[PDB]
């Protein structure tokens, strides 16, 4: 794709999320960089409105799949870069089992030389004293695979995948994601054969940051189409 040429080096990233969870309004700003060569993302996120009123791990998937590393033989299946620089809309419903759900609408596009992910998030039906509003999730990560399928009727891609959040009592809190992406521009995009994205990541803290925050490292690699 023409868009893939924008990803041969490390690219600065800006993430802006405005959220409303059960009427709790909050904002997150993230800044860092991504390299599709190795699939590596390094970002730091800050809640700019005070304490984050949901658990940081539940926002990881919402807070830039154009930085996934597509192997050479899979380059023709990289929808996300093909839509650049004009970008794409990424929409999700994220349903937390036995709890509420997030609805997210994001635009991922270049604004100058920076790849920007701007998200509006709405959460409803979260339970008082549940794992989300009660912050009962461990500050940690499970590696995942997310399967990507073409959505030709929308000139885009869909994905359904479950995230497993560890709860403080040793249970697991599933977050079932339904995702759709559509190009912002009118130019040609690559509609992929079925494949998946594999993630390995790491959530940490900046010992000198006083605000509520999350330091994130995430590798994303495309797989599932062989020679």
UniProtKB/TrEMBL annotation:
Organism this protein belongs to: Aequorea victoria
SUPFAM superfamilies in the cross-refs: GFP-like (SSF54511)
Protein name: Green fluorescent protein
Matches recorded under InterPro entries: GFP, GFP-related, Green_fluorescent_prot
Any Gene Ontology biological process: bioluminescence
Gene3D superfamilies reported in the protein's UniProt record: Green fluorescent protein
Annotated keywords: Chromophore, Luminescence, Photoprotein
Superkingdom of origin organism: Eukaryota
Signal peptide: none
The keyword Mitochondrion is annotated on this UniProt entry: no
